[PDB]
Every structure is written in C-alpha cells, then in structure tokens.
Write a protein that binds this DNA or RNA. Structure first.
Length: 797
DNA sequence: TACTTTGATTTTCTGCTGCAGGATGAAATCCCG
DNA sequence: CGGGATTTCATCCTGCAGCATCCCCGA
RNA sequence: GGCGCGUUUAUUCCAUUACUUUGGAGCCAGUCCCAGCGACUAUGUCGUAUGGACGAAGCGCUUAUUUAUCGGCCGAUAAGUAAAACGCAUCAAAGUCCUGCAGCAGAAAAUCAAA
C-alpha cells in the first residue's frame, strides 16, 4: 500500500536519531481562524456534532483590524523614508546596510592592499582594504577581503568581494541599527512610526522589533539585486559597443544613410534605462527596415543590439494581503501558544497576541507534573536546550487582548500538534515564529470573494535521522515519455535484472509502468476544448485548469510511487541528466507537460525534511542512452547525417548512399508542418532530389555552395535512419525486437553504472593531456557495454 | 494588380516561475510600587 | 526588593565534463 | 455548465479538528418569455439557436398532527407532516509559508516593408 507517511515511518524505524545542527529542517502550518461562517458550516451538517467551538470575539477582531492597519502604515512610512534616503545618495545607504563580519574573526591581519573601494559613511572616511588568505577543507586556496576604518567606533571587518573594482557581497537585515533611530524616544529623527501612527497605543518592543526585520529584509534584497545587476549592465555595454560598431561599418559598406544617434553613458536610474531602450529599439527598427528586409541579410552576420533588462524598483513605494508579524515565541515578545491538559494525551489549543499597552499575560514556572484542570499550559525553549513548562493565566474579557481559536484537520494535527514521535512537550519540535494573513477567499454560499483570516506557524525539527547506515545497493532506471509517464527497471549492483515485480498476470518481471491511462485523459480534455473552440471560438472557465491540475496530480502520484518502490526495494534512483527546465517547447505543447524538475524538487524536499541529503537515494547521470541497442551498442546520431551526405552518388535505379558499410536505399516521402500554409504538405524525397539535380551536372556534392547543400541535408534528415515505428524498436545487428521504453529505462541505470567505471577514468586521464573529442566517448560506450554483455549481461533469447 | 507569413514599435489583460531578505533570544538598564 | 518595560547586541561551510537529453527547418 | 452529501490518507494507541485542494460517485441543464440567419424594400420576420431574461437541481426506513373507507379513533394505505437517528448512492490521495522584485509566456488592438 502506498502512503508517504508509511514510508516516513519505515525510514524512522530503520535508522537511529541524532540532534540537529545549528538550524534544522523547517516546516510551516497554515490553518484558518475559527470565524462565524465556519461555525454555521459546522452547524449545517446532517449529523450535528456534540460540541461546537466558540468563534472569535468581536473585541479580538477589532483589535486585529486596528493592528493590521497600523502595521501596514508603519511599513509604508519607513519604506518611503528609506526610498528618499537612497534616492539622495545611493553610496551612503549601500555602505550603511553592508553586513559586518562576526565579532569573533580576530585572526591576525597579515597583508594590506598592495584601497579606496568604499568608505564608512558614518565618519566619511575611506574604507581601506585588507587581505586574508586561508585554505578550505578540500584544499582549494581562498582569499578573504575585508574593509577596516581607522575610527575606533568603526573598527569593523565589513566583507568585500573581489572583481577583475570591489563589491560588498552581503546585505544583512540586522547590520543597520533600526531600533535606536526610529523607535526609542531619545532619538531626534523627524520620522517616528510608533509615536505618530499608532497613537502611543502599541508596545514599543515587539512592534518595533518586527518592523526592523520587515523593512530591512526588503531593503537588503533590493540593494543586493541592484548591486548584482549593475555589473551585468557593464558587461552588456561592453559587448554591445563592438556589435554596433560592426553594424555601422556594414551599413557604411552598403552606402545607406545611418541615423546620427549615439548611446548615452551607462545610467543608474530607470529614466536612463528607458532612454537607452528607446535608442536601441530605434536602431533595431532601422536595421530591420534597411538590411534584413530589403537586402535579406542573415541574423548572425547582422545581429541587433540587446536591451537592458532586470533593473529593480524600490519595494512597495515605486508602485491585497495584510500581514501582522510575530518576531518569536518567548516571554519577551508577549506571545504564547497555550494548550489545555485533559488526560496525558490530549490538548485544547488557543493562541494569544498581546501587542497593546495595558495587557496581562504573566507566566510562572511550575513543577513538571503540576498540571491541573481549567488551567492553561505552554513550553518555552532555551538556547541551552532545556524546556521549561510554564502555565499562562489571563482574563478572557480583557479589552486589550487578542484571542484566536484555530481550525484544522486530523492530518495537520497528527503532523504538528500531537505527533507521536515529534512531541513538542519534550522539545523534539520547536515553534519558531508565526504570522497572521488576511486575504480574499471565495465563499460559495454568497458566490463572492470575502476577506478571510489565516494563521501561519513555522515549526523547526530538532531531531533528524542518521545517514551513516543508509547504503542502497540495487538500482532503478527511470525512462520518461509522453505516452506513458514513466517506465522503470530494477537491477542489482552487478547490473543483472531482478525479477521481483508483479505484472497484471502476476508473472515475475523487472518492469513496471506508473501513471498509465493518462494520455487518453488529456486527449479527451483537449478534444472537448477543440470542440468548444470550433463551436463558439472560446471555452468555458472549466477547461482553464483541468490539464494543469491533472498533471500536478499525476506527477505527485508518480513521485510518491517511485519513492515507495525505492524505499521498500532497497534501491537508489537514477534520473537523466536533463538541464533544469528541460522539455519540448513547440506548437501544440503545454506547460503542464514539464514534470522533470518538479518531480526532482518534490522528492528532494521530502527527503530533506527528514534530515537526509539527496545523495542517499537520489542521483543523476548521462546523452545517447535511448539510441543504443542492447545487442551490440550501435547508435544513430543527428550529426551522423554527414555520413549519409558524404557520398549520395547516383545509380540507374535512383540515388544511393551508405553508412558504416551498410547500403541505404534512397526513397521515401516527407510531410512537414508548412507554417507559411498552416497545414501539412506531402513531398516525395526522390522527386525533390531529382528537381534539385535538374540544374546540376553529375550531381556532385562538392559543387554545392551553401544553399542546395542545406536543402539536400534537410531532405535527407528523415530517410531510413532509426525509426520504422515510433514505439517499436528493432536492432540492426540481428533484428532484436523489444519495447523502446524498457530498453531506455535499463540503459539509463547502466549509464549511471558506466560513469563510475574505470574506462571513464582513463578517458578523463587522456582528457588531462587534452583529448576533447566526441567519437571517443561513443567508442568507449560501445566497447564497455559490449564487454559487459559478454561477461554478465546475458541477453534474452 | 488575387490576398499568406515573417521581422518589428507600442497598449491592455490572464497567468506561472526564479531569486534575494527570512523564519530572535540573552542580557543590561529605567520606572515603580 | 521584585517586576515589568524598554534598549543593545550578535549568531554561519566551497558543487566536474556531454554535443546537444525535442530542437533542426528552405524560401 | 451548475447544485449538495460527504468516506479513507497513524499499526493495539492520539480529538469524523471542523482548514485548503485533487480524483470518484449523486441530481438539474428546461421555459417562448425576446432579439438572430434562409432572403431582405434595410430601426419592420413565414422555418430555422447567433445572442438575452427567468426557473431547476437524492432515495429509503422508525415515531402525533386536515379527509376517504367501513365495522359505532379500537382499520390500514395517499398527501401536508416536527425533530431524533440509521442505511444506500459513495469512494481514495496531498499540503512549506511571508515580503519584494523581475523574468517567462498566451491572447487581442494602432503603423513600415516584401515574392
């Protein structure tokens, strides 16, 4: 039976546990606040429940609304002030937000600059550069660059990033002292958020400490993006000037009137970017009108300019959810998660937020087993690792409190609240922080979008598994296709197939197919879509997201099934070394057909939450795996058409060509998607070649300049090459016949085994002297695979 | 002097994904009763 | 003499190799 | 296209806690109440859906309440019929969030050029 939780239980039961590092895996719970609509929904069931919870009181709702409005206004005001400050002088803010080194890097500085990279704007003094060289754990030498000022107050070690001329490299949200400037009343800054916006009603500590992060994170992100994008602008300008010089020279060579417009110097604001893009667009329009259109010049010989893209805008000011933030869960920030003991295995959950002046949420430590009825309890986590159970007492009718009852399901509760293993009572799970989200949700009863209150609570796992004993031996190759989502094959370390799966007939085998019946489903959906489109020119809202939802369902289920098979079979998964975002980008393609990276990421995240690295069960490997027969190892190539076009000599019966000593009969018909006609036109290959040969003598290939060679190659690129049937596969050596997907799945695992063989090592050693080639790789492939077929990989007869 | 595709400027709308900042308590001083 | 409420502060390492794996077409 | 019931995703144990989705199953998709096309003399349709306006949306079983029907409610079945409770249709999976930026697309509209 296939459940992810059963797999997780199997993993936990099969391995030991250890304490997590400095920061462990983190997971988030998103639930909803018990509102009156949920109360009515619970009251309208056929079988009414015995005890319906009370909804959130009016006072809590009013206080929450007031707090949300004030928080949003404060964030806007601070962001506006820092936007103005950045506009006045970018360099000052850039140096101020720079994240200093930890106050423990006290290794003896050895070498200064061989100096004016930046400057400490606090004292307006140059920030002299100092060097520090060290060697990492793997032996690669690394040089650390630091900036130090002569001022005792500014005796810091700001990080610097060398460039081939220096950059900062880091922008932290705590580098700038936000609290002492805008929060405390001792400062004389003209802009004070809490004193002016909140009307002296909000507690300084928690609200200020929340605003600090809420603003500095955005400012740091914006500054990092700005700093990164400036260098790419320099590179683009450098690569663009030469190209425009070449284009101007070409235009002068044709004797046309080139416009007298010159590039502006590199800008640093959005208006300069706009002007530069306008000039580039004008130049490209002129080039299009004069060179490619009238004279028909190719793109490579006359290539356009490139626009300036990626310049960021200041957060939230250079122009909806309302967010109330909680910095942390400790007695200092005036927030708590309270649960009522009734029995040694039951809880009753609430969450209290006291952000107002004139509230009472006093704690007091209790004995480990001093629990009493009608009294609330909670736990507090320390840096030292100790857990102190403390009880919370307060007044339910407090006019300054915020009381939130939560609503969730059994799955979420078993995952976080009352989990069997990760029980937060003993400290195995720690509550990190939380948020309050106010967003619009669809109400089906009223058929309107209405505001709803959500609660997000992030939990950090403190005990993880030990990967020192997870050593899979067997292998599983996954071959993906469009007709079938996935076909897999199970092999032992030696590579021999393992007959442990069961087919429909129950016979032993080593092949399974996952997610079948898909193709007819999306084809029915597309048939309905096309019928509606032909009927009325458009489809209803139903067919907007059916394919996407079904594809997401299928990829999730396939990932779950392969995870189950790998875990229960003691095998390590192998995927194809496809670059991220790989897929077919054509005419009738859909974005719902790209589930390679999505699957890898889902599997990686699921393995990561348990504390194991991806290399324990998940891997990648290599190119030329689907085009290889399992009898001798012959492989066809797209570049192998050069062999076809090498002779192309003519006989009395027509054209003839040979590849690898095998005669090829030149005949066949070609049907291609003619975009000029938006239809399919069928042409005869021999007839096309004869029409080409009408204007040629002796039909010699070497007499071809550029064009007729390309047209003949495009004609010949179908012929008799590798594919009588798309799904069926036949081997050229002895006529071996087998399904293509199964062979591809087996060959992917065998390729992964190959990339760690000794032939590959000697290949790389020859690469050390320099042997970058293409034919040698395929030759080693064929030789190794033939040897392995000879020794251990007995073929099926 | 019939009536397709391509390359291109701008205008709007619907979506969908990548990538930075993240996931804070310990302790030292005022104010006060 | 506690008991809150407000202010300062400081916490982090170095990933290998294929010509294309659905991207090459005639005009 | 819409309208509602909801079960399973922990092994003897841990909230039919109730949230957000996916898949399956269940029911209604009609009314002439109007304006279209065949061709039109071009603010006026004989047959025909190109659009508009209203309405629609489980079945059983156990418990009083208006009549028929004869023995003078002791006779049950038909509707209106309160609430409790059960059964069937009807069954299985998943969830890591916030902020700010940009980048990818898809579809329409105003202008230059071509065999």
């Amino acid at each position: 039976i296939k459940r992810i939780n059963k797999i997780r239980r199997r993993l936990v039961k099969d391995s030991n546990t250890k304490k997590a590092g400095k920061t462990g895996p983190m997971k988030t719970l998103l639930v909803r606040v018990m509102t009156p609509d949920l109360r009515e929904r619970l009251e309208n069931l056929r079988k009414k429940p015995e005890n319906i919870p009370q909804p959130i009181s009016n006072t809590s709702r009013a206080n929450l609304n007031k707090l949300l409005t004030d928080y949003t206004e404060m964030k806007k005001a601070i962001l506006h002030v820092y936007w103005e400050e950045f506009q006045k002088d970018p360099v000052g803010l850039m140096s101020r937000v720079a994240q200093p080194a930890p106050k423990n890097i006290d290794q003896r500085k050895l070498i200064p600059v061989k100096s004016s990279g930046f400057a400490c704007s606090q004292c307006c003094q140059p920030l002299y550069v100092y060097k520090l060289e060290q060697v990492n754990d793997k032996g690669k030498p690394h040089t650390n660059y630091f900036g130090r000022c002569n001022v005792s107050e500014h005796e810091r070690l700001i990080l610097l990033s060398p460039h081939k001329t220096y950059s900062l490299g880091k922008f932290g949200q705590r580098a700038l002292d936000f609290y002492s400037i805008h929060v405390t009343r001792e400062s004389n800054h003209p802009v004070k958020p809490l004193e002016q916006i909140g009307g002296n009603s909000c507690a300084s500590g928690p609200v200020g400490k929340a605003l600090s992060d809420a603003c500095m994170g955005a400012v740091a992100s914006f500054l990092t993006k700005y700093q990164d994008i400036i260098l790419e602008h320099q590179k683009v300008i450098k690569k663009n000037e030469k190209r425009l010089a070449n284009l101007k020279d070409i235009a002068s060579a044709n004797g046309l009137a080139f416009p007298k417009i010159t590039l502006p110097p590199q800008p640093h604001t959005k208006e300069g970017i706009e002007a530069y893009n306008n000039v580039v667009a004008q130049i490209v329009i002129w080039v299009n009108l004069n060179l490619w259109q009238k004279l028909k010049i190719g793109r490579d010989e006359a290539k356009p300019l490139q626009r300036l893209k990626g310049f960021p805008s200041f957060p939230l000011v250079e122009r909806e959810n309302s967010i109330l933030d909680i910095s942390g869960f400790s007695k200092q920030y005036n927030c708590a998660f309270i649960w009522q003991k009734d029995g040694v295995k039951k809880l009753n959950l609430y969450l209290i937020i006291n952000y107002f002046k004139g509230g009472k949420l006093r704690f007091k430590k209790i004995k480990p087993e001093a629990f009493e009825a009608n009294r609330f309890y909670t736990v507090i986590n320390k840096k030292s690792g100790e857990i102190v159970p403390m009880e919370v007492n307060f007044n339910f009718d407090d006019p300054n409190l915020i009381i939130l009852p939560l609503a969730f399901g059994k799955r979420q509760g078993r995952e976080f609240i009352w989990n069997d293993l990760l029980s937060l009572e003993t400290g195995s799970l720690k509550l990190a922080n939380g948020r309050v989200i106010e967003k619009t949700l669809y109400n089906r009863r009223t058929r309107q979008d209405e505001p709803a209150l959500f609660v997000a609570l992030t939990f950090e796992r403190r005990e993880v598994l030990d990967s020192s004993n997870i050593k899979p031996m067997n292998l599983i190759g996954i071959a993906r296709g469009e007709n079938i989502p996935a076909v897999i094959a199970l092999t032992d370390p030696e590579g021999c197939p393992l007959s442990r799966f069961k087919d429909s007939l129950g016979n032993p085998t080593h092949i399974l197919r996952i997610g079948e019946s898909y193709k007819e489903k999306q084809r029915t959906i597309q048939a309905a879509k096309e019928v509606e489109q032909r009927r009325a020119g458009g489809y209803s809202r139903k067919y907007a997201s059916k394919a996407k939802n079904l594809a997401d369902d299928m990829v999730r289920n396939t990932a779950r099934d392969l995870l189950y098979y790998a875990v229960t079979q003691d095998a390590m998964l192998i995927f194809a070394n496809l670059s991220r975002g790989f897929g077919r980008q054509g005419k009738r393609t859909f974005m719902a057909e790209r589930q390679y990276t999505r699957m890898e990421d889902w599997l990686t995240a699921k393995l990561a939450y348990e504390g194991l690295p991806s290399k324990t069960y998940l891997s990648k490997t290599l190119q030329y795996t689907s085009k290889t027969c399992s009898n001798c190892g012959f492989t066809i190539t797209s570049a192998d058409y050069d062999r076809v076009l090498e002779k192309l000599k003519k006989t009395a019966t027509g054209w003839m060509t040979t590849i690898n000593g095998k005669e090829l009969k030149v005949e066949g018909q070609i049907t291609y998607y003619n975009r000029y006609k938006r239809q399919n036109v069928v042409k005869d290959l021999s007839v096309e070649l004869d029409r080409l040969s009408e204007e040629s003598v002796n039909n010699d290939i070497s007499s071809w300049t550029k064009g007729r060679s390309g047209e003949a190659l495009s004609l010949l690129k179908k012929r008799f090459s590798h594919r009588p049937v798309q799904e069926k596969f036949v081997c050229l050596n002895c006529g071996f016949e087998t399904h293509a997907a199964e062979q591809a799945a087996l060959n992917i695992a065998r390729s992964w085994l190959f990339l760690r063989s000794q032939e590959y090592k000697k290949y790389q050693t020859n690469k050390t002297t320099g042997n970058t080639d293409k034919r040698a790789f395929v030759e080693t492939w064929q030789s190794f695979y033939r040897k392995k077929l000879k020794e251990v990989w007995k073929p099926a007869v």
